[PDB]
């Protein structure tokens, strides 16, 4: 468990992805339940150290997205091909 | 930092505060030939004070320097220095004359330093030089030129060393 602060993202595009990665922010999604996907962009640097412990992948996250919270799990992770940066993490509401 | 944020000059000695030199003055030696470069001049009762000259952010490399550098001259006019400077092996003489010191290591020809003032030569022996000196900087240099006639070497030990024995020893072989 970690109580992550991340926030709305809203532009789809590889390009726009490249623009995100110029900040620490990497794009990312919550999807799950009966409500349409929530396009957020978490902060790498926080999340880097937090995903380094096993606890992340194992107990509940509660991703605080502008003032509300959604409890998810981090399932899958498409990180950078060779750098300790991330590029993406899929999160399924569980 | 540490030293560079440490201030101390006693009332045993005296000063000629100036805005571009830090002068001490007195007896037993005196006079200061290190000068400002990168540091201010402030004063205090018990300290000849200086922080870094402004418009330069690297001036505390020069300051921690300036610090020990001032106080050492003060130690020179209160206490001796360069305390002795021995030499391993023998028949390597002395002179101790007007300010020249001869020393042999198979020198047919004399080897001398007409020393500056403020550094004394003395010995009782042909294996030793006993110098009290003032102004750690000054002295130390002229002091080196002496022992620098021949370097100490490890395979028979001989060669003008320092006060303390800080050689390496490697066995000879082929006997």
């Amino acid at each position: 468990m970690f109580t992550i602060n991340a926030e709305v993202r809203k532009e789809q595009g590889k390009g726009a992805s490249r623009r995100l990665r110029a900040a620490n922010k990497f794009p990312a999604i919550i999807y799950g339940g009966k409500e349409a996907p929530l396009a957020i962009e978490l902060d790498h640097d926080k999340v880097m150290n937090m995903q380094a412990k096993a606890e992340f992948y194992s107990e509940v996250l509660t991703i605080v997205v502008d003032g509300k919270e959604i409890k998810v799990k981090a399932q899958d992770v498409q990180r950078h091909p060779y750098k300790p940066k991330l590029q993406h993490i899929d999160f399924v509401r569980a | 930092s540490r030293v560079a944020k440490a201030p101390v000059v006693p009332a045993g000695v005296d000063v000629k505060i100036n805005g571009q030199v830090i002068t001490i003055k007195g007896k037993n030696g005196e006079l200061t030939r290190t000068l400002n470069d990168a540091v201010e001049v402030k004063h205090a009762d018990n300290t000849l004070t200086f922080g870094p000259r402004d418009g330069y952010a690297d001036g505390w490399a020069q300051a921690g320097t300036a610090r020990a550098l001032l106080n050492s001259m003060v130690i020179g006019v209160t206490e001796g220095f360069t305390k002795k400077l021995q030499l391993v092996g023998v028949g390597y003489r002395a002179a101790v004359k007007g300010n020249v010191i001869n020393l042999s290591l198979g020198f047919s020809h004399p080897v001398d330093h007409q020393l500056p003032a403020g550094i004394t030569a003395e010995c009782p022996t042909q294996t030793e030089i006993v110098l009290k000196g003032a102004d750690k900087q000054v002295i130390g240099q002229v002091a080196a030129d002496l022992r620098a006639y021949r370097r100490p070497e490890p395979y028979k030990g001989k060669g003008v060393r320092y006060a303390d024995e800080v050689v390496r020893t490697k066995e000879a072989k082929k006997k």
């Binding site: - | 021995q86 391993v88 006060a163 303390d164 024995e165």
Partner: protein, 141 residues
């Protein structure tokens, strides 16, 4: 600086001394009087356990004269006697050449007590046990 000076230490037999290799040159360098010590040492060694190697520490003065304090024989040696062996085990811990009862160690610890720092008998006794384990000498309660 350079120089050198005395306060030497050595382990010589009880009633025997003077040999050059064992003694002689050893302290002779410091400026000790071989002859004097030879008789002087063996003099008191008569009272002390004869035939047992006792370590003596000689301290020379500027007078070139000297004094020495006869302590108790090494724990290793004492263990050899108690175990009734002549030498160690070569490869201690791996192969035991002898054994010593927990009672004996206490006796040896009592003998070495004078030279040991052990605050209590347990400490001194263990101090020797560490020497025994290093000699390949097992200790049965």
């Amino acid at each position: 600086a350079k120089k050198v000076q005395a306060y030497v230490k050595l382990q010589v037999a009880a009633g025997m001394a003077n040999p050059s290799p064992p003694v002689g040159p050893a302290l002779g360098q410091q400026g000790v009087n071989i002859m004097e010590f030879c008789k002087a040492f063996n003099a008191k060694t008569d009272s002390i356990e004869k035939g047992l190697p006792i370590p003596v520490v000689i301290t020379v003065y500027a007078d070139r004269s000297f004094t020495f304090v006869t302590k108790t024989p090494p724990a290793a040696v004492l263990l050899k006697k108690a175990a009734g062996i002549k030498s160690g085990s070569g490869k201690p811990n791996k192969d035991k050449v002898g054994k010593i009862s927990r009672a004996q160690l206490q006796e040896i610890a009592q003998t070495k007590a004078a030279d040991m720092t052990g605050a209590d008998i347990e400490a001194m006794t263990r101090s020797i046990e560490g020497t025994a384990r290093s000699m390949g000498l097992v200790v049965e309660d």
